[PDB]
Design a binder for this molecule. Structure first.
Ligand SMILES: Nc1nc2c(ncn2[C@@H]2O[C@H](COP(=O)(O)OP(=O)(O)O)[C@@H](O)[C@H]2O)c(=O)[nH]1
Ligand SMILES: Nc1ncnc2c1ncn2[C@@H]1O[C@H](COP(=O)(O)OP(=O)(O)O)[C@@H](O)[C@H]1O
Ligand SMILES: OC[C@H]1O[C@@H](O)[C@H](O)[C@@H](O)[C@@H]1O
Ligand SMILES: [Mg+2]
Ligand SMILES: [Mg+2]
Length: 1039
């Protein structure tokens, strides 16, 4: 499997490369060293914080202060390059840009952002689109695979199948940002997983055809789409591709007759001149691009890295696959050549005012390939006839009017031809009956240029609808989540904010811009000036979205979602009417070419108003085409892809802060994860919340059975304001920022209990023991000393001797802390504390012996007792109940502790029960064969016999142990009677060993004092020894 294999291309091209921050308490923030250059950020370290402000170190070294509201906190470096950014604590501009930057530098162009897929144009070839790549994403969910256009394509496909619902992928972005390359990938993927195959190939081959006739080199993209498109991939009930349909929008017809410097005309013109055979060149009267006015004005006839000749062969091959006949292909080329020839017709002034045509070469070449009469064409261009009552009189046009008519004819022919290709492709691919479909929208985003005309208003009007569509979708998703989880919160319809701009544009009852343009377009003697005047007269100061400029008399402003746009009214009347002289329509209707004739005969192509209609303007036509696209999208489950251009130079590895940040602000990516930040943006299943924050609260198992109760426990302990959250049916919900704060607590907490893992080793292990080993088990396998012994052996006694004061009558965790002589030279009073009794202090050891008998209502849950005394050494012990009914469980409980390799065993056994067939010592020999972590404690050395001695074990020769043996004698039952305090017993024990016929030689290595010192030492070094290993565990448990 490629997904797991590190040495796989999948990990090499789609996966990010590969305890540090664990102990660290450092927190950084993004800031711009220059308050003017808001796009340039630097990372600063935080060193101070009030109740609503931050203080941090600047790269220069100076300290700065910023309020926690305007603060752009930085996410932990561990989260750099996260597949999905929606899972980040902070989503400010710099944090978002940083995550993309990190990924982009590793050639990872795809990243998620909520219901958004972000794709940053690499402007370079990246091997992640091969068949093998496609096979890897098949079936996978958007979680088990890295971000990729294939991933959302599969999710859409699976969704269509599983929900029996149509889907749509809206791929938008600035010119050259990558919309078309991604659109093709989606089609590529679909044809592969649901598709080799005649139909499949035809669907794929329709693209080169449309790009040839609809794409061109612009200053921003060598392969710019000069039309928008919606592609429907149709499937049958079984999920197999059954067809496809294509709709085209806003083809830039003016490009055919005029291109700005360095740009080109549509690819097909250069493809035809370079790739036509010698026979085709002759028949079509071709020549080099420089010989044609429509291709020799911009200064550019070729594109670097592009072979127009090779592209022509590909285009021709595609037409064969799709099914265009040979004759049809020739007719198409004749139309392209004919247009070129029309562009070469040079009108000049005649004897009078009317234009004349001196040279007929171009006119005749055109007439020949078009299959129309030259004499008729010439008269239709310079002497078109107009209706004058019950008669028909000719109108001799001057040069300017003649030239414009020729151009209008060129644009109509190209536009019609283009619609014809699309129709022919649809006839071959579309299937009137399909069970479901996945639609892909590849169209330009908002266009805000220096000069914006009628075309820009159309594309911007389209983007107001698309943006409104996305906002409403987000609203519905949010509302559906809140309802499902029964969270009482209601938002104001997000899509409502853009209704005013839309109405200002396409509003009917209250006359909108388009309605006024249409009214004015049919007005008797209307002009662009009367048009702009009507607009100002209707919206100036009357509509908040409209603006009459201070000086310009030919422009008006519209506040669009992406900002204000100024539109020039010039030629709008003419663009909305798109006139063509009737005599030119007649001339071509009499063409001898089958295709030319259809361009003028087919109503669905030749006229905007089909059979029966009265009259329709271009604006009204597009309003309807757009309304129909929206209605189709509204029957689908939408998926969104946001393409970003890295810079404005079409260069690889060159991500520019300003250019990228600008897109993220009007693209919707930033605004998106900002519109929901008013309710409860963050929501976590109770189990997952507990599994992560159980640490911030005591008595909360990482896997509590009642996840909801545990969650409440944590929230209360942290003193979280109940208004900042809500308890859903399966998840806890949080207001914006609340989850981030809790996460910060988790980070700080973790740092305060692991920093000590760098003497004071015992207190550190103690903290970890209180945080984890409290529930009952030993997760981290902490370095500890476990005391075990048989019934009536002397455990309680010795423990009491170590404590130096009686306090004993489930596992017992005794954490002793030595209290140093007070600074006053005085001796602090000894007291005890329990973990289950947070604020209680037991200065009276009497109620401690009782409190133990209290809480003991056998269990595996340990009782955490801490004792601070100036009479004890620093030491922690785990006292386990003495050893076939319930003891059967005890043996397992014991074995559970002494099994751990990080545990030291203190075997307690009396000296009046020999060694032959002992108990504890043998029980330890099971889990510790070599006896390298077991220390024996011999008691009752005074209750042996007449001459019975035990120096044979104390010297380590009977039952040898690495840690050896230590002898001790505690109070007898009769000693417990009356006074006889532990201290007095101790004073007695010393004399016993000091003045003993045999033990006197090892006196110094005997006694409670010696035992305490030794246990402290063993524990101190054992922790030191386990320190390395334990740090590996801790780090893994917190991740
Ligand atoms: N004379 C004497 N009695 C002892 C000694 N150690 C324990 N005992 C007595 O043995 C009994 C049980 O001891 P204890 O420490 O409660 O044993 P445990 O069952 O392991 O808790 C008590 O009556 C103690 O006074 C010792 O060294 N000498
Ligand atoms: N993912 C990609 N891999 C390689 N080149 C790409 C990629 N996306 C975009 N490009 C490059 O960017 C150019 C412009 O992309 P394009 O999809 O045509 O932009 P848009 O359609 O948004 O105007 C491409 O023709 C190509 O050189
Ligand atoms: O004018 C009535 C309606 O016509 C539709 O075509 C537009 O898409 C709507 O936005 C508009 O409200
Ligand atoms: Mg494109
Ligand atoms: Mg005991």
């Amino acid at each position: 499997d490629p997904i797991h294999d590190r040495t796989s291309d999948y990990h090499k091209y789609l996966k990010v490369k590969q305890f540090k921050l664990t102990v660290s308490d450092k927190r950084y923030i993004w800031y711009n060293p220059d308050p003017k250059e808001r796009d340039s950020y630097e990372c600063g370290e935080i060193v101070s914080e009030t109740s609503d402000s931050f203080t941090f170190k600047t790269v220069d070294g100076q300290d700065r202060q910023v309020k926690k509201d305007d603060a752009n906190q930085r996410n932990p470096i561990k989260f750099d390059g996260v597949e999905d950014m929606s899972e980040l604590s902070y989503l400010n501009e710099p944090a978002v840009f940083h995550n993309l930057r990190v990924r982009y530098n590793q050639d990872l162009i795809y990243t998620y952002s909520g219901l958004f897929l972000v794709a940053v144009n690499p402007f370079k070839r990246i091997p992640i689109y091969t068949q093998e790549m496609v096979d890897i994403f098949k079936g996978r969910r958007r979680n088990e695979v890295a971000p990729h256009i294939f991933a959302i394509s599969d999710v859409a496909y699976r969704s269509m199948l599983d929900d029996r619902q149509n889907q749509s992928l809206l791929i938008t972005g600035e010119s050259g940002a990558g919309k078309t390359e991604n659109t093709k990938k989606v089609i590529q993927y679909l044809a592969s997983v649901a598709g080799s195959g005649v139909l499949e190939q035809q669907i794929l081959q329709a693209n080169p055809i449309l790009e040839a006739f609809g794409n061109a080199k612009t200053t921003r993209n060598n392969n710019s789409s000069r039309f928008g498109k919606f592609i429907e991939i149709q499937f049958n009930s079984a999920g197999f591709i059954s067809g496809a349909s294509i709709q085209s929008y806003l083809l830039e017809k003016s490009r055919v007759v005029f291109q700005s410097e360095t740009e080109r005309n549509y690819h097909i013109f250069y493809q035809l001149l370079a790739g036509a055979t010698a026979e085709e060149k002759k028949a079509l009267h071709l020549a080099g691009p420089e010989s044609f006015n429509y291709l020799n004005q911009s200064g550019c006839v070729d594109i670097k890295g592009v072979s127009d000749s090779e592209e022509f062969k590909i285009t021709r091959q595609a037409m064969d696959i799709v099914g265009f006949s040979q004759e049809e292909q020739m007719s198409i080329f004749k139309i392209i050549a004919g247009i070129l020839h029309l562009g070469n017709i040079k009108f000049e002034k005649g004897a009078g005012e009317g234009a004349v045509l001196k040279d007929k070469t171009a006119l005749n070449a055109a007439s020949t390939v078009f299959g129309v009469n030259p004499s008729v064409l010439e008269k239709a261009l310079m002497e078109p006839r107009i209706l004058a009552g019950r008669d028909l009189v000719a109108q001799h046009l001057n040069v300017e009017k003649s030239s414009s008519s020729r151009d209008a004819l060129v644009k109509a022919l190209y536009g019609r031809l283009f619609l014809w290709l699309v129709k022919k492709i649809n006839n071959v691919l579309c299937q009137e009956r399909k069970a479901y479909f996945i639609g892909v929208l590849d169209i330009s985003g908002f266009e805000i240029f220096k000069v914006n005309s009628f075309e820009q208003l159309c594309i911007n009007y389209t983007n107001e609808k698309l943006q409104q569509f996305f906002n409403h979708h987000m609203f519905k998703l949010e509302q559906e989540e809140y309802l499902k989880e029964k969270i009482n919160w209601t938002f104001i319809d997000f899509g409502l904010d853009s209704q005013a701009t839309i109405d200002l544009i396409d509003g009917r009852q209250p006359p909108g811009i388009l309605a006024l343009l249409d009214e004015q377009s049919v007005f008797p003697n209307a002009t662009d000036n009367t048009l702009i005047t009507k607009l100002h007269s209707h919206f100036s100061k009357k509509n908040a979205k409209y603006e009459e400029p201070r000086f310009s008399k030919t422009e008006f402003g519209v506040t669009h979602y992406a900002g204000q746009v100024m539109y020039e009214i010039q030629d709008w009347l003419e663009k909305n009417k798109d006139p063509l002289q009737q005599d030119l329509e007649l001339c071509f209707k009499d063409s001898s070419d089958n295709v030319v004739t259809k361009l003028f005969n087919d109503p669905n192509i030749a006229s905007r108003a089909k059979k029966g209609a009265n009259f329709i303007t271009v604006a009204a036509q597009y309003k309807e085409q757009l309304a129909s696209l929206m209605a189709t999208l509204e029957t689908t489950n939408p998926h969104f892809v946001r393409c970003i251009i890295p810079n404005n130079k079409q260069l690889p590895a060159k991500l520019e802060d300003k250019v990228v940040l600008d897109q993220l602000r009007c693209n919707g990516v930033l605004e998106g994860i900002r519109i929901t930040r008013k309710g409860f943006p963050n929501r976590i299943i109770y189990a997952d919340f507990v599994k992560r924050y159980y640490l911030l609260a005591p008595n909360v198992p990482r896997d509590a059975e009642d996840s909801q109760k545990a969650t409440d426990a944590v929230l209360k302990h942290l003193n979280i304001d109940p208004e900042q959250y809500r308890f859903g049916i399966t998840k806890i919900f949080f207001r914006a920022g609340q989850l981030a704060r809790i996460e910060e607590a988790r980070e700080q907490r973790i740092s305060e209990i692991t920093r000590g893992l760098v003497d004071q080793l015992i207190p550190v292990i103690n903290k970890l023991q209180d945080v984890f080993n409290t529930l009952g088990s030993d997760p981290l396998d902490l370095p500890q000393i476990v005391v075990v012994g048989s019934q009536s052996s002397g455990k309680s006694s010795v423990l009491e001797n170590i404590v130096g004061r009686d306090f004993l009558p489930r596992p017992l965790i005794l954490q002793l802390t030595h209290l140093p002589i007070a600074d006053d030279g005085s001796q602090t009073q000894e007291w005890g504390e329990f973990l289950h009794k947070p604020n209680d202090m037991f200065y009276d050891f009497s109620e401690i012996r009782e409190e133990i008998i209290r809480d003991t209502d056998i269990s595996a849950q340990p009782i955490n007792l801490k004792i601070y005394s100036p009479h004890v050494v620093n030491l922690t012990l785990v006292d386990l109940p003495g050893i076939t009914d319930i003891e059967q469980q005890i043996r397992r409980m014991v074995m559970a502790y002494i099994k751990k390799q990080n545990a030291i065993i203190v075997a307690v056994t009396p000296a009046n029960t020999d060694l032959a067939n002992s108990d504890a010592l043998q029980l330890a020999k099971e889990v510790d064969p070599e006896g390298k972590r077991t220390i024996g404690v011999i008691t009752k050395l005074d209750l042996m016999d007449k001459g019975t001695d035990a120096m044979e074990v104390l010297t380590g020769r009977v039952i040898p142990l690495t840690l050896g043996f230590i002898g001790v004698i505690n109070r007898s039952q009769e000693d417990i009677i009356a006074k006889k305090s532990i201290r007095e017993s101790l004073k007695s024990e010393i004399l016993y060993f000091k003045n003993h016929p045999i033990y006197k030689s090892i006196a110094n290595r005997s006694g409670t004092a010696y035992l305490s010192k030794t246990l402290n030492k063993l524990l101190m070094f054992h922790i030191r020894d386990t320190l390395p290993d334990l740090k590996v565990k801790v780090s893994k448990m917190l991740s």
